[PDB]
Design a protein around this nucleic acid. Structure first.
Length: 165
DNA sequence: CGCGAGTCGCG
C-alpha cells in the first residue's frame, strides 16, 4: 500500500493511475527505476535535484504532493477498469476540496477521461476546475509510454511555468 | 441523425 503525500498550500498534487507492483511493495510512489516521474519533475523544475522514491515525503518541501486515482496495485494501468477509475475520481475530488492545491495534475489522458467522465480531452490545462484548483492532464511517466523524456519534461515544465510566484 | 459503448502496433 502506497501512502498519499498531501497537505494544504501545495502548488501541485500529482495523481497517477494506480501504484505499480514495486511501488506497492516499497510503499513509495513511482518506485520502479524504469519510471520517469522523479527525473521528469526534477528536470521540469519542481525539485532542485532528482529525489529517490524513498525521499517522497520531502515533496511537501517543494510544495508538491502525490496521490493516485486507484489504490489497488497492478502491473499495467490498463488492468484498472473504468469503473474503478470513475470511483477514484469521486474520492480524488474530496481530497482536492480538502487540501486545495493550486493545481491537480492527472497523469494520463485516459485516466482523466475515466476518472472525470470527460470526452476527447486534450493534453495540458483543462477548463474543468475543482473550486480554485485548476486541472491539468500530463503524460504518464511510465516506461511503457512511448512518449520521450524530452516530451515528458516539456509537458510538465509548462505546468510549472504556469503556477506563478 | 445522435448517442453510448464494443483491440493493435508503436521504443
Amino acid at each position: 500500500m502506497v501512502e498519499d503525500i498531501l497537505a494544504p498550500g501545495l502548488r501541485v498534487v500529482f495523481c497517477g493511475i494506480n501504484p505499480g507492483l514495486s511501488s506497492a511493495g516499497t510503499g513509495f510512489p513511482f518506485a520502479h527505476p524504469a519510471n520517469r516521474f522523479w527525473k521528469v519533475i526534477y528536470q521540469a523544475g519542481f525539485t532542485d535535484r532528482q529525489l529517490k522514491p524513498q525521499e517522497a515525503q520531502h515533496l511537501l518541501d517543494y510544495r508538491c504532493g502525490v496521490t493516485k486515482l486507484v489504490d489497488r496495485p497492478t502491473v499495467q494501468a490498463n488492468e484498472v477498469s473504468k469503473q474503478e477509475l470513475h470511483a477514484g475520481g469521486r474520492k480524488l475530488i474530496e481530497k482536492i476540496e480538502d487540501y486545495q492545491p493550486q493545481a491537480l495534475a492527472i497523469l494520463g489522458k485516459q485516466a482523466y477521461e475515466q476518472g472525470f467522465s470527460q470526452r476527447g480531452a486534450q493534453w495540458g490545462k483543462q477548463t474543468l476546475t475543482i473550486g480554485s484548483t485548476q486541472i491539468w492532464v500530463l503524460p504518464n511517466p511510465s516506461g511503457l509510454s512511448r512518449v520521450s523524456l524530452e516530451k515528458l519534461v516539456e509537458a510538465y515544465r509548462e505546468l510549472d511555468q504556469a503556477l506563478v510566484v
